[PDB]
């Protein structure tokens, strides 16, 4: 009748009477969990305070250890006993490292220059962050360098709209399918609605649905307070310089605005020129690979932020978002990507690709050089390789899958 915390103590202890705190921490990191994880704060607080009462500030005997670990014991136990969605995380991150290096050799593409903020980023910035639905984290390359979401925001604001207003309301204004033609084509579907919320027209109408009857200052903070929940309070910023240049060069976008109002695509009472303004702000929100990967993980984890356990989005909002990301998330490459990679992803002109592996993990990949369709060259290459290695394709089978690795099972 041994308690969970007695069990944890004996596994880490390895026959000794006291556990050096450094060894507990080292072991914890090996699971992929960070000591900074919000769900572990109490354990970390207890360790700090309790170690200052100690003669050496290193050694925790059973009862002390049992006390520090109690409040997080189930999570800690899942972690050490290899119960997380990827049980061998160190192995896995080694594979991610190799795919990153491989992608790294692809130096083609051209950095976006429609505004000068984008022009300025070095071609060789390349980072990849992973966050599992259990909050196992890993990064390689440039993962702490801020950049703009640009179109990666589309699926997120659409999720907010569905979360507050429901599917039926939002889809009075916007369709649910791929256009079938080129994204760079201004047109509406059979019922006069933009085809889906991933095309520019659709994202603009969706923008107009959020926090109606309030002002652009309030709308934008409401949206940021949302992205922060999605990211477990990790970095969400704003580029006022991108916002200005986006607005300075907004002719092509305003037309769409005009066209959309003329066809009665906005809700009764819409101030188009302000909606477009709000739309430019949201494109200019800043993330890192690290923080964006938790956002994607929230989407992989059914709307719950994996590093806080907080419900951030309704199930209907998440499911839908993933469905539209599957179909319309990579511009003109969307159908090929669906076919070959088979994961919900969303690209943006800053070089970001937000990727979800449902039930497993989120990922943000970033490299500024873009191919012909406006997708990141390193990012597209990486996403192909991940799915060649691992049985992550939507329509990969979990029992019979050839020479693919399944990271959810142990070697």
């Amino acid at each position: 009748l041994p308690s969970l915390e007695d069990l944890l103590f004996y596994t880490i202890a390895e026959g000794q009477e006291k556990i050096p705190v450094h060894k507990f921490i080292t072991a914890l990191k090996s699971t992929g969990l960070r000591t900074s994880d919000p769900r572990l704060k109490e354990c970390m607080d207890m360790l700090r305070l309790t170690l200052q009462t100690t003669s050496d500030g290193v050694m925790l005997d059973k009862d002390l250890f049992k006390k520090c670990v109690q409040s997080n014991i189930v999570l800690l136990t899942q972690a050490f006993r290899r119960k997380f969605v990827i049980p061998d995380f160190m192995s896995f991150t080694s594979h991610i490292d190799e795919l990153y290096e491989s992608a790294k050799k692809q130096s083609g593409g051209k950095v976006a220059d429609y505004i000068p903020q984008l022009a300025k980023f070095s071609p060789d910035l390349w980072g990849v962050s992973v966050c599992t639905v259990d909050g196992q984290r890993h990064s390689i390359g440039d993962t702490k360098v801020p950049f703009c979401l640009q179109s990666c925001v589309k699926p997120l604001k659409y999720a907010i709209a569905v979360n507050d207003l429901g599917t039926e309301y939002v889809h009075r204004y916007v369709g649910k399918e791929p256009s079938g033609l080129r994204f760079n084509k201004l047109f509406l579907n059979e019922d006069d609605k933009p085809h889906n919320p991933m095309v520019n027209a659709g994202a603009i109408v969706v923008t107009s649905l959020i926090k109606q009857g309030v002002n652009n200052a309030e709308k934008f903070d409401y949206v940021m307070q949302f992205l922060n929940k999605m990211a477990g309070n990790e970095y969400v910023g704003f580029s006022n310089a991108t916002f200005q240049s986006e607005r300075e060069s907004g002719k092509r976008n305003f037309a769409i605005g005009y066209y959309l109002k003329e066809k009665k695509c906005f809700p009764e009472g819409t101030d188009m020129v302000g909606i477009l303004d709000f739309y430019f702000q949201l494109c200019s929100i800043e993330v890192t690979c690290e923080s964006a990967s938790v956002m994607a993980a929230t989407l992989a984890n059914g709307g719950f932020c994996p590093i806080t356990g907080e419900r951030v989005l309704s199930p209907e909002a998440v499911r839908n978002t993933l469905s539209l990301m599957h179909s319309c998330g990579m511009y003109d490459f969307s159908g090929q990507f669906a076919f070959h990679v088979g994961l919900p992803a969303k690209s943006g002109v800053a070089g970001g690709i937000l990727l979800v592996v449902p039930n497993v993990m989120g990922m943000m990949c970033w490299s500024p050089p873009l191919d012909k369709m406006g997708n990141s060259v390193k990012g597209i290459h990486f996403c192909h390789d991940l799915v060649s290695l691992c049985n992550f394709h939507n329509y990969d089978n979990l029992r019979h899958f050839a020479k693919k690795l399944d990271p959810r099972r142990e070697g």
Binding site: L1, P2, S3, L4, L7, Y10, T11, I73, V74, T77, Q78, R81, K83
Partner: peptide, 14 residues
């Protein structure tokens, strides 16, 4: 939960 883990692991480890 806590119960499920405690059964499984006491067995395996003890």
């Amino acid at each position: 939960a806590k119960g499920a883990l405690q059964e499984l692991g006491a067995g395996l480890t003890a």
